[PDB]
Amino acid sequence: MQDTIFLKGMRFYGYHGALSAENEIGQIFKVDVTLKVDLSEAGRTDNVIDTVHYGEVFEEVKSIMEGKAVNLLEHLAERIANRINSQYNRVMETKVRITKENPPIPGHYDGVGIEIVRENK
Amino acid sequence: MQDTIFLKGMRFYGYHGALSAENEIGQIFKVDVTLKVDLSEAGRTDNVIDTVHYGEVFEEVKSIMEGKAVNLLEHLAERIANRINSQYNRVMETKVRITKENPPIPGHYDGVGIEIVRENK
Amino acid sequence: MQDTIFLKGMRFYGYHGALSAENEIGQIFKVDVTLKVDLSEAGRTDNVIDTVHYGEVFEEVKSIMEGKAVNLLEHLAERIANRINSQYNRVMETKVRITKENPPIPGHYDGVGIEIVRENK
Amino acid sequence: MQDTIFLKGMRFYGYHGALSAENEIGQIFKVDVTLKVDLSEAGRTDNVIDTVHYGEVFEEVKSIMEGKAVNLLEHLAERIANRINSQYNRVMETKVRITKENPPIPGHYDGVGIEIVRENK
Amino acid sequence: MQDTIFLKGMRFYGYHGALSAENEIGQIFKVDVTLKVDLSEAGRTDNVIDTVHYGEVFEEVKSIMEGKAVNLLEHLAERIANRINSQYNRVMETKVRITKENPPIPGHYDGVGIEIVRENK
Amino acid sequence: MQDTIFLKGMRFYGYHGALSAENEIGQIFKVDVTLKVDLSEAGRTDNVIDTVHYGEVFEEVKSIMEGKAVNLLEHLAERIANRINSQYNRVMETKVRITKENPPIPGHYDGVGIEIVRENK
Amino acid sequence: MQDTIFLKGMRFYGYHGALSAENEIGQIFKVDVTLKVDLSEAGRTDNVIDTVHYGEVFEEVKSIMEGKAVNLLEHLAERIANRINSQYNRVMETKVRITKENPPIPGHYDGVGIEIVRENK
Amino acid sequence: MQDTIFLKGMRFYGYHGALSAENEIGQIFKVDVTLKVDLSEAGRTDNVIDTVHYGEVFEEVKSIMEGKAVNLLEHLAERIANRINSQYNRVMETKVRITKENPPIPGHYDGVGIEIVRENK
Numbered sequence: 001m002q003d004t005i006f007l008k009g010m011r012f013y014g015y016h017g018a019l020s021a022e023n024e025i026g027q028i029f030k031v032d033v034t035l036k037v038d039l040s041e042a043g044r045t046d047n048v049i050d051t052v053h054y055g056e057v058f059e060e061v062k063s064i065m066e067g068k069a070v071n072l073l074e075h076l077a078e079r080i081a082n083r084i085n086s087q088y089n090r091v092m093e094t095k096v097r098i099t100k101e102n103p104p105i106p107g108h109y110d111g112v113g114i115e116i117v118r119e120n121k
Numbered sequence: 122m123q124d125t126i127f128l129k130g131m132r133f134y135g136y137h138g139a140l141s142a143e144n145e146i147g148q149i150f151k152v153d154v155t156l157k158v159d160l161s162e163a164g165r166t167d168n169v170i171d172t173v174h175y176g177e178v179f180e181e182v183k184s185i186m187e188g189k190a191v192n193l194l195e196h197l198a199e200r201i202a203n204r205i206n207s208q209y210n211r212v213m214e215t216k217v218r219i220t221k222e223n224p225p226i227p228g229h230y231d232g233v234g235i236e237i238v239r240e241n242k
Numbered sequence: 243m244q245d246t247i248f249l250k251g252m253r254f255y256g257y258h259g260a261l262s263a264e265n266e267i268g269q270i271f272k273v274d275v276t277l278k279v280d281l282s283e284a285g286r287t288d289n290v291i292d293t294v295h296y297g298e299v300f301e302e303v304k305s306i307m308e309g310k311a312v313n314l315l316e317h318l319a320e321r322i323a324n325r326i327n328s329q330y331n332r333v334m335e336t337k338v339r340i341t342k343e344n345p346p347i348p349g350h351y352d353g354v355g356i357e358i359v360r361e362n363k
Numbered sequence: 364m365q366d367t368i369f370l371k372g373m374r375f376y377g378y379h380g381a382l383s384a385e386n387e388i389g390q391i392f393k394v395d396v397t398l399k400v401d402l403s404e405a406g407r408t409d410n411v412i413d414t415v416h417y418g419e420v421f422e423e424v425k426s427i428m429e430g431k432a433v434n435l436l437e438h439l440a441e442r443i444a445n446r447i448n449s450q451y452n453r454v455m456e457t458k459v460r461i462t463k464e465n466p467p468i469p470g471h472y473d474g475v476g477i478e479i480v481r482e483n484k
Numbered sequence: 485m486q487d488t489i490f491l492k493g494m495r496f497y498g499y500h501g502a503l504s505a506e507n508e509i510g511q512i513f514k515v516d517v518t519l520k521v522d523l524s525e526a527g528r529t530d531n532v533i534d535t536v537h538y539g540e541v542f543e544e545v546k547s548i549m550e551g552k553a554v555n556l557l558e559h560l561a562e563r564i565a566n567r568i569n570s571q572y573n574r575v576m577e578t579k580v581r582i583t584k585e586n587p588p589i590p591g592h593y594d595g596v597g598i599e600i601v602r603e604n605k
Numbered sequence: 606m607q608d609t610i611f612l613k614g615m616r617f618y619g620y621h622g623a624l625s626a627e628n629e630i631g632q633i634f635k636v637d638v639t640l641k642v643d644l645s646e647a648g649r650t651d652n653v654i655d656t657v658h659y660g661e662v663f664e665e666v667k668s669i670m671e672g673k674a675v676n677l678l679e680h681l682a683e684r685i686a687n688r689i690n691s692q693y694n695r696v697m698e699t700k701v702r703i704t705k706e707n708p709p710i711p712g713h714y715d716g717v718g719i720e721i722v723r724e725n726k
Numbered sequence: 727m728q729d730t731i732f733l734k735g736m737r738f739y740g741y742h743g744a745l746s747a748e749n750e751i752g753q754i755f756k757v758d759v760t761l762k763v764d765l766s767e768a769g770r771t772d773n774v775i776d777t778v779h780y781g782e783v784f785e786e787v788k789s790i791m792e793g794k795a796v797n798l799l800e801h802l803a804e805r806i807a808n809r810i811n812s813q814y815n816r817v818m819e820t821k822v823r824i825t826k827e828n829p830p831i832p833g834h835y836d837g838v839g840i841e842i843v844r845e846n847k
Numbered sequence: 848m849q850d851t852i853f854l855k856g857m858r859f860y861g862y863h864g865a866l867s868a869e870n871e872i873g874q875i876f877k878v879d880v881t882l883k884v885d886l887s888e889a890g891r892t893d894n895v896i897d898t899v900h901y902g903e904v905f906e907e908v909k910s911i912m913e914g915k916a917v918n919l920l921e922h923l924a925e926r927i928a929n930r931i932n933s934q935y936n937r938v939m940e941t942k943v944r945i946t947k948e949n950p951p952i953p954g955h956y957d958g959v960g961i962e963i964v965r966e967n968k
């Protein structure tokens with residue numbers, strides 16, 4: 001099964017970061033979420049109830065990215081993946097990518113970050 | 122076999138959507154279509170008859186994206202995949218991606234959507 | 243005097259629009275603000291008090307773009323220009339540009355909108 | 364008066380061109396339209412009747428770009444400018460820009476084209 | 485072995501096409517070439533003789549894209565793949581992608597095209 | 606008179622440069638050309654003879670950018686402006702912009718260059 | 727005289743900022759420099775001595791952007807403009823633009839900043 | 848395990864190259880680094896000590912890209928991969944991509960380069 005649902009380039013202003021100054025000032029975090037879901041029934045019925053609603057998905061992502069400040073990107077991505085899988089049975093697997101296009105790194109790069117893939121149990 | 126034929130970034134203005142206001146106003150839908158096809162004969166002969174004509178492919182995609190208004194993206198992608206496979210034997214498999222870069226989602230993201238891969242029977 | 247202060251590409255999700263469906267669903271509004279201000283003293287002193295603070299400027303723009311829903315872009319731009327000039331004497335003139343990259347217009351365009359220039363009285 | 368209304372990046376597939384092969388095949392034409400209009404009343408009242416409706420403007424542009432095939436870009440831009448000024452008194456002046464990003468020119472360039480500014484009489 | 489050598493976004497103005505008008509006028513063709521090659525020796529020695537020279541590769545691609553006019557993209561990609569493999573033993577496999585961002589297709593899309601992967605015999 | 610004709614982003618691979626190594630290796634030069642021309646007659650008649658043909662213009666630019674290697678950008682832009690004005694009476698003024706996006710400058714910048722405006726005598 | 731010399735998109739990682747946390751962490755500053763200079767002699771002679779060398783210009787900009795940490799953008803732009811005019815007589819006027827694409831501003835915008843134009847005395 | 852850590856679009860100005868003129872003048876090298884690392888513990892603990900610090904990673908990449916001049920890209924990528932794996936046990940595998948967007952290649956392409964994947968021993 002290679003069907004997916006996606007939310008690309010979501011961006012949030014949060015105060016996460018290991019450096020005290022990071023949590024003080026804050027920055028923009030870019031998030032990509034890809035969910036493994038079978039979409040043939042929904043594609044057959046045309047009934048939004050036979051699939052996963054993204055607006056809802058976006059609400060989960062948001063509430064986490066714009067919530068309490070944490071240290072690592074790995075913690076935010078793990079809270080999002082775990083949160084999405086717990087609420088939706090149809091999501092067979094969840095992939096979370098978080099990019100920090102402007103970390104406290106003296107240099108020229110397009111962005112830094114992490115990505116994780118969490119299968120639904 | 123890893124050969125493909127592609128039509129990237131096709132965009133259509135349709136009135137699909139689960140929200141009544143969506144079907145009223147309308148929006149732009151971006152579509153990516155990748156077809157699995159063996160192109161060595163055509164690459165050998167140089168005869169357009171030994172391959173799949175995209176302009177035709179685009180016509181199928183268009184007629185569906187700019188046709189009657191439906192509820193889900195999964196329905197549009199399933200009508201396109203099913204329609205392409207039924208008309209072309211050379212297409213061993215069809216992948217359809219539809220992006221809604223501006224859904225009724227209060228936030229900042231690059232786009233939301235779905236993707237499906239339908240092997241030809 | 244050709245010095246300016248600028249805030250480019252600010253984007254807000256608001257429910258402004260003349261069509262009822264527009265106010266229902268909402269969309270993203272992109273805003274560009276250019277202020278006429280003499281920056282030689284501040285450039286000489288290096289004292290933020292001798293110039294106009296943008297973060298503050300952004301707060302004014304935001305509070306208007308993300309406030310009550312209105313009909314026209316001309317009303318939002320006029321509320322922003324009038325609001326910026328009333329609060330800052332150093333701003334000799336204010337230019338406001340608002341773009342609706344996705345209005346209820348069946349077609350392919352990069353965006354539509356208005357721009358106004360309001361000298362400070 | 365430096366207020367304006369704009370429609371940027373409109374794109375149409377038309378068959379205009381001096382070369383017979385151009386009119387046969389066709390291409391995409393990108394159009395930018397900037398109208399000189401006083402928007403303080405509309406910005407004051409918030410009444411769409413006190414300003415120029417772009418969707419209407421876009422309809423005029425479209426009907427010309429997607430109408431009969433002509434030879435020059437100068438003819439299309441002159442038909443659009445003349446057409447916009449004749450229908451709207453509030454438009455003090457109209458600027459039309461048409462770009463042919465893919466003319467029959469053997470080379471590497473981003474695009475070619477013309478621009479005209481037509482004051483309303 | 486997942487090492488590769490690449491030449492991305494090469495663009496050529498050629499007169500290939502099935503439509504007579506296409507061969508008359510011409511257009512820009514974008515080409516992506518990815519070659520499978522083991523680069524540890526060259527990465528170890530730092531000797532350009534232990535690897536595949538791209539400038540040479542580009543010369544082969546060019547001479548084909550800017551040579552006699554043919555009908556299909558599949559023919560150009562097959563002439564390039566076959567030509568690269570015949571001249572270089574180190575290339576274990578060659579992938580050719582050709583995009584026609586402006587074919588004679590009445591519509592709005594980012595580009596159309598084909599891709600092929602040819603293992604070296 | 607604010608009408609213009611334009612050729613944007615033309616790019617050529619030439620060996621111009623003050624540094625011997627520059628003339629040896631070569632680089633890509635990006636060129637923008639804006640010509641002042643009255644386009645109302647041509648816009649009225651639709652006759653390409655009542656205006657300035659760009660393809661021709663591009664040929665002049667090309668023959669200079671891809672010709673003998675010189676030292677300065679100012680020399681190339683002056684040869685182009687002077688060449689365009691001498692051949693076309695309708696061009697009331699010519700503006701030439703040449704960008705070196707990759708000069709021998711150790712740093713991170715989008716590009717360097719010059720621009721000149723030459724009225725036709 | 728409308729000739730200019732330009733350096734666009736220069737970017738530097740500096741620790742300037744009014745907020746202590748800003749000077750601690752640092753960020754990327756984007757700089758645009760446009761110099762008013764008559765380039766007809768240099769365009770006539772082709773002698774780099776009859777014009778202003780940008781690499782040198784870039785060195786001045788750099789040494790200031792990557793030097794001691796200051797409070798305002800207005801101070802950096804004033805040090806650059808003043809520094810360029812003092813060293814080059816041919817520069818009739820200097821324009822400096824500095825953008826902070828990621829200031830400590832909780833929001834979504836493309837960038838904030840200032841611009842100044844300093845005529846040479 | 849499909850988790851990764853990434854640093855995309857890092858760019859450095861180095862003097863590497865097989866052509867003497869290349870080492871003389873220099874150019875910008877773009878680097879992409881993807882590291883295979885298990886991020887569930889760190890995602891669970893939120894402790895930066897349970898993962899690989901990128902700023903450190905960037906320092907290794909930098910010191911190599913901005914160090915002594917070498918001949919091939921394969922040598923730089925092999926020094927980076929080997930250097931990252933030797934210093935971090937958590938990195939199960941390292942992928943290095945280096946692009947030369949402006950090599951001494953007379954043509955129009957987006958960039959050329961190599962990529963390697965080095966599993967950690």
Ligand SMILES: Cn1c(=O)c2nc(N)[nH]c2n(C)c1=O
Pocket residue numbers: 016017018019071072073074852895898899900901902
């Ligand atoms: C905030 N933050 C992170 O999340 C992080 N994750 C890794 N792997 N390294 C990190 N650093 C340095 C950091 O500052």
Ligand SMILES: Cn1c(=O)c2nc(N)[nH]c2n(C)c1=O
Pocket residue numbers: 005048051052053054055137138139140192193194195
């Ligand atoms: C129109 N529309 C869809 O097609 C859709 N598909 C999914 N999975 N969720 C959807 N929502 C919320 C929607 O409004």
Ligand SMILES: Cn1c(=O)c2nc(N)[nH]c2n(C)c1=O
Pocket residue numbers: 258259260261313314315316368411414415416417418
């Ligand atoms: C919401 N809205 C506007 O603000 C507007 N301003 C002009 N000039 N025309 C407009 N239309 C059609 C609209 O729907």
Ligand SMILES: Cn1c(=O)c2nc(N)[nH]c2n(C)c1=O
Pocket residue numbers: 379380381382434435436437610653656657658659660
């Ligand atoms: C279609 N077409 C034009 O409109 C045009 N306008 C100018 N000035 N030159 C032109 N050429 C060559 C052309 O083919």
Ligand SMILES: Cn1c(=O)c2nc(N)[nH]c2n(C)c1=O
Pocket residue numbers: 126169172173174175176500501502503555556557558
């Ligand atoms: C020039 N040309 C092609 O190469 C081609 N290849 C496929 N598969 N279809 C094609 N058409 C319609 C075309 O015009």
Ligand SMILES: Cn1c(=O)c2nc(N)[nH]c2n(C)c1=O
Pocket residue numbers: 621622623624676677678679731774777778779780781
């Ligand atoms: C090739 N080249 C130029 O054309 C040039 N023009 C100015 N003003 N400065 C220049 N330098 C340094 C250069 O190398």
Ligand SMILES: Cn1c(=O)c2nc(N)[nH]c2n(C)c1=O
Pocket residue numbers: 247290293294295296297742743744745797798799800
């Ligand atoms: C660092 N910094 C500035 O340079 C600045 N310049 C203006 N006008 N406002 C500014 N703020 C808020 C700031 O933090």
Ligand SMILES: Cn1c(=O)c2nc(N)[nH]c2n(C)c1=O
Pocket residue numbers: 489532535536537538539863864865866918919920921
């Ligand atoms: C500097 N340099 C390289 O690193 C390289 N690597 C390959 N495979 N070919 C190369 N050429 C031509 C070059 O000039």
